[PDB]
């Protein structure tokens, strides 16, 4: 084993040396001679009441009008953003939920949690009700995130240090993705849906291939857990937020870190991260009950969003970029514009 | 508002009505989380998730066990945590003490109380009357400890068993009171595998927890 360990150390050294000959400038100095942004003041336009417990997840729909929300009281609600009407209310077999998703076509929703199953609910059907379509079993730990690729494929992350792809009609795993050392906490898909990234508790993020099943790159700069992750709209960068009280921006073509977003007053964690339609603003939610708007090209704060009485747990931006949605542990949701 | 929009509003109102009814039903029940280790006798106390329901004096209870730095945040609004320890395997007491310290100082659990259950006391009596194993070979400070003078209750047992019991009680309680700021308390108890009076202790302790909660809101304490 001594020979193998020595080879591994040499290879890590070679990687670190090659990712230094490829760094000649910095994003800070490439973007010095441009005019800044200004002050972004946003005001609450809606407040959506109805839950009686903590809120853990939310997801927008592709029509930019409908959204779904998950709560610890054991219920899922489909809202209408423009009028604050309730469209559906789905009872759950378990009350320990940590994720939810909304299909691109609009026919299905998904949810899962501390019971090791991902459930798919059929929304529009005869008989008028909403009923279960499929239950997927096979993970050996709690589910943390799920995203739809199409109407018959889904990607899940779990706390057993693994990720899987499923075929819904048959109900079976197709590819297993392995390699992390700790729990996986979030994942995000690319616009073309041929890659995705996952962030874990070993202070690393990995970039995967969907068809082949392999792992192409690994990024390591943080110093504690990674809770949120998201692509740039381009498809060639992503942002990660940690319990270290920092966010970072990574590149896939140069294979290293370009920018860090920190300030000496923040000492809390980061729970959620999102971008804007242009890729110029970065939204991040904190444990200190409020949310911050960052400039993604100069590492400067552009504004705050202060309206919640408890922890901020989820975040989201509409496809057309007209609104942002936040949910909190104080059982409310808000839309800003 | 058009005709269809008014109909949509009426449907939304009915959804709200059912939500409120379900919430009022759920307000009555009390929730508990059961932690412990293997060989703790954890599954024989109240004689993914394994749930359990029972009631005493017309009050409902709901008990969970999971079979942890991450999912422990979900259990942030429960009434109590029930911690169970075997008090006969001296080789594995220090693991239990460290585990208790970790679960006592957690960030998300700064206002949740703990009900201890030092289980399997008949085996402890046998092993302390046998003489073939020494408690002081594992904790040296047992040589220089004496029972509190005027606070020694017992039902008719030996003095040596009383010393052995009180030492372990002290170890856990003095982890508890080192740094807690008076915002949450620890309630210790002794039980075997045949004790049937275990659903009443939880009821009394929960009544005390709710008394403290009521006092804090009205600024009395």
């Amino acid at each position, epitope marked *: 084993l001594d020979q193998l360990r020595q080879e591994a150390e040499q290879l890590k050294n070679q990687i670190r040396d090659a990712r230094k000959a490829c760094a000649d400038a910095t994003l800070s100095q490439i973007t010095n001679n441009i005019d800044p942004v200004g002050r972004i003041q946003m005001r609450t336009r809606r407040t959506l009441r109805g839950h009686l417990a903590k809120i853990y997840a939310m997801h927008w729909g592709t029509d930019s009008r409908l959204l779904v929300s998950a709560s610890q009281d054991g219920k899922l609600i489909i809202w*209408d953003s423009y009028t604050t009407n309730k469209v559906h209310a789905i009872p759950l077999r378990s009350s320990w939920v940590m994720t939810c998703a909304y299909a691109p076509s609009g026919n299905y929703v998904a949810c899962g949690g501390l019971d090791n199953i991902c459930s798919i609910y059929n929304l529009k059907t005869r008989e*008028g009700n909403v009923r279960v379509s499929r239950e997927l079993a096979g993970h050996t730990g709690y589910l943390s995130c799920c995203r739809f690729l199409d109407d018959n494929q889904i990607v899940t992350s779990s706390g057993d240090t693994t990720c899987a792809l499923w075929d819904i009609e048959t109900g079976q795993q197709t590819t297993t993705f392995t390699g992390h050392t700790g729990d996986v906490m979030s994942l995000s898909l690319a616009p073309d849906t041929r890659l995705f990234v996952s962030g874990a508790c070993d202070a690393s993020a990995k970039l995967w291939d969907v068809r082949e099943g392999m792992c192409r790159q690994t990024f390591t700069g943080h110093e504690s857990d990674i809770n949120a992750i998201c692509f740039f709209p381009n498809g060639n960068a992503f942002a990660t937020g940690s319990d270290d009280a920092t966010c970072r921006l990574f590149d896939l073509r140069a294979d290293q870190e370009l920018m860090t977003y920190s300030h000496d007053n923040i000492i809390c964690g980061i729970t959620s991260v999102s971008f804007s339609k242009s890729g110029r603003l970065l939204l991040a939610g904190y444990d200190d009950f409020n949310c911050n708007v960052w400039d993604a090209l100069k590492a400067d704060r552009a504004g705050v969003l202060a309206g919640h009485d408890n922890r901020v747990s989820c975040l989201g931006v509409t496809d057309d970029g007209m609104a942002v949605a936040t949910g909190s542990w104080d059982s409310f949701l808000k839309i800003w514009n | 508002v058009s005709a*269809e929009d008014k109909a949509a509003a009426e449907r939304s109102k009915m959804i709200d009505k059912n939500l409120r009814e379900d919430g009022e039903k759920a307000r009555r029940t009390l929730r508990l989380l059961l932690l412990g280790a293997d060989n703790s006798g954890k599954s024989t106390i109240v004689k993914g998730i394994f749930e359990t329901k029972f009631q005493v004096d017309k009050v409902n209870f709901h008990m969970f066990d999971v079979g942890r730095r991450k999912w422990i945040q979900c259990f942030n609004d429960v009434t109590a945590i029930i911690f169970v320890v075997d008090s006969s395997d001296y080789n594995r007491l220090q693991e239990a003490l460290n585990d208790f310290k970790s679960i006592w100082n957690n960030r998300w659990l700064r206002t949740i109380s703990v009900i201890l259950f030092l289980n399997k006391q008949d085996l402890l009596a046998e092993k302390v009357l046998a003489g073939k194993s020494k408690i002081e070979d594992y904790f040296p400070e047992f040589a220089r400890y004496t029972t509190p003078e005027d606070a020694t209750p017992e039902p008719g047992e030996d003095p040596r068993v009383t010393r052995a019991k009180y030492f372990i009680r002290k170890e856990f309680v003095d982890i508890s009171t080192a740094s807690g700021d008076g915002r949450h308390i620890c309630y210790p108890h002794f039980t075997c595998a045949v004790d049937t009076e275990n659903a009443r202790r939880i009821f009394n302790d929960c009544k005390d927890i709710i008394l403290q909660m009521n006092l804090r809101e009205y600024n009395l304490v």
Partner: single-chain antibody
Amino acid sequence: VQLVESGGGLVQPGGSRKLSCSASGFAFSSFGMHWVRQAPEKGLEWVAYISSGSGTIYYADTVKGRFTISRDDPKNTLFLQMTSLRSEDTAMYYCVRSIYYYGSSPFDFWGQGTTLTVSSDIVMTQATSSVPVTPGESVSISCRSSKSLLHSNGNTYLYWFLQRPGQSPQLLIYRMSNLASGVPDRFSGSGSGTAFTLTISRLEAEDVGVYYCMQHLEYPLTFGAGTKLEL
């Protein structure tokens, strides 16, 4: 899904009768239910409405004070009670289900009917009354309204129905552009305010009958007169 209706028969003038409709196959308690009648040779006219939760009721002005609507959710039944029957009430009666939320498709299912023989408003017209067609062609049908059907929120409330010989009508287009479930993709519809058209491509047998257009902007609900296609 099913809806079966009973009652009917001869009734002397001035008498009384009760019509009942029994459901089986769907979640009845979350649907709002209508009554629609058809004369011996005329078009379709609306009668009443009961809401989910029984919180709203509406009546046509021709039957107010004589007819009453009710529902019994646990046994899944709908009722209509006659009083002071006249000679203009000879018709065949239908029961219709409708559900209202964002993106819904009201007026989905129409039951069969029962016969009963006894011994302002938005007027909207279908000028064409008979068109002869041959298979493999394309045909267009028009009806226009009295006032505009385009609300502020952006929806044009207009509906299209089809009634084949000796059957009960079915839904094709809801809100002037959308296509119902089970309907082949050769039907289409478009228009502006106060003008509407339906286009059929590759016309076939089993696509002949009478076509109706309805408005759903404000009560009462108002139907057209009927364009029919002949071989």
